[PDB]
Structure formats: structure tokens, C-alpha cells
Paper text:
The functions of HIV Tat and TAR in promoting elongation are completely dependent on their ability to hijack the host super elongation complex (SEC). The SEC consists of the Cyclin-dependent kinase CDK9 and Cyclin T (CycT1 or T2), together known as P-TEFb8; one of either of the intrinsically disordered (ID) scaffold proteins AFF1 or AFF4; one of either ENL or AF9; and one of either of the RNA polymerase elongation factors ELL1 or ELL2. AFF1/4 is >1,100 residues long and is the principal scaffold that holds the SEC together. In this study, we set out to visualize the last of the three known interfaces critical for AFF4 function, its binding site for ELL1/2.
Here we work with a fusion construct such that a stable obligate complex between ELL2 and AFF4 is formed. The crystal structure confirms that the AFF4-binding domain of ELL2 has an occludin fold, as predicted from the sequence homology. It shows that the IDR consisting of AFF4 residues 301–351 (hereafter referred to as AFF4ELLBow for ELL1/2 binding) folds up into a helix and elbow joint arrangement that makes extensive contacts with the occludin domain of ELL2 (hereafter ELL2Occ). AFF4ELLBow is ordered over residues 314–349 and buries 1,535 Å2 of solvent-accessible surface area. It begins with helix α1 (315–324), is followed by an extended hydrophobic sequence (325–327), a polyproline segment (328–330), an extended region that doubles back on itself in what we refer to as the ELLBow joint (331–343), and a second extended hydrophobic sequence (344–349). Hydrophobic side chains of AFF4ELLBow α1, including Val316, Ile319, Leu320 and Met323, are buried in a hydrophobic groove formed by the C-terminal half of ELL2Occ α1 and α2. AFF4ELLBow is centred on Trp327, which forms extensive hydrophobic interactions with the side chains of ELL2 residues His559, Met562, Cys614 and Glu615. In the AFF4ELLBow joint, the side chain of Leu331 sticks into a pocket comprising Tyr552, Tyr555, His618, Leu621 and Ala622 of the N-terminal half of ELL2Occ α1 and α3. Moving closer to the centre of the AFF4ELLBow, L331D and I334D reduce affinity by ∼20- and 8-fold, respectively. This highlights the role of hydrophobic residues in AFF4ELLBow helix α1 and immediately C terminal to it in the central cluster, as the critical anchor points and affinity determinants. We observed a cavity at the AFF4–ELL2 interface that appears likely to be present also in the AFF1–ELL2 complex relevant to proviral activation, on the basis of the complete identity of the AFF1 and AFF4 residues involved.
Numbering used by the authors:
A (entry chain A): 14 to 49
B (entry chain B): 525 to 639
Write the structure that this text describes.
Amino acid sequence: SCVDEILKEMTHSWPPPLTAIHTPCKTEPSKFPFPT
Amino acid sequence: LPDYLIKYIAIVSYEQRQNYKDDFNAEYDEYRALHARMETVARRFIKLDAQRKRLSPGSKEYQNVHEEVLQEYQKIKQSSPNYHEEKYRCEYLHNKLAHIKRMIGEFDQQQAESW
């Protein structure tokens, strides 16, 4: 129960880290919908 | 409405691209450190969650996973600075830097459409 809530809060999938800005831009970024 | 959406608008010149890139780089180190911590913290709980899902609820292993979740969460609750402040900082930096990079990428696309 409490453990269920803990795991719900802590197991959210983070996006990969943004890469540095190559010239020209190599990877297309995007806004991420972080949970709230 | 996040401030970086008001500040970092569409790029009209290469000097602006340079300034945007420099601003991105100025916070990239903090961003990567925080992001790495967030992934490392999440990993333990994702692992424990998967274990809990594949275990028999009548097994001692199940009780051990339960206990380990409680202990690790206790570690997080007592950490300094507060975990939630770090998480908020990391989300803000991620979407800010993503936005700046988006402005730079859309500019690059536009420039490539005209030469």
C-alpha cells in the first residue's frame, strides 16, 4: 500500500539526457510531459 | 508559463544562435549531473518494482523487496538537499535546454532551406 505509492512516485521514466548542440543540430529535441 | 519560453524566441541571426548555444552550455554541466542522479535514484526503485511484480507474494523474497523499498525511500526522504527540489530543478533544466536546442534546430533547418 505505502510501498505501492512509493513505487508509483519513484518509477517514472525519465527521458534520455539531451546531447550537446552540434552544428548543425544532429538530434531533434522535444518538450517532455513530466508527471504532476 | 516558464520564463525561458518568453526569453528564447525564434532565432534571426547566427550571432543569436551562438548566444543561445553558449547559454545552453552554461547550464549543461549541472543539468547532466542532476539528470544522472535522477536516473540512478529511479533505477533502484524500478528494479525493486519489477522484482516485486515477478515474485510470489507468499515468498520471503517478496517481504525483503518490500523492506528494501521502505529503506531506500527513507534514504531519499532524508537526503539533502530535498529530493523534490532536485527533481524540479532537473525537469526545469531539461525542458529549458530542450527548448533552447529546439530554437537552434529550427533555425538550422530554416537556413538549410535557403542555399
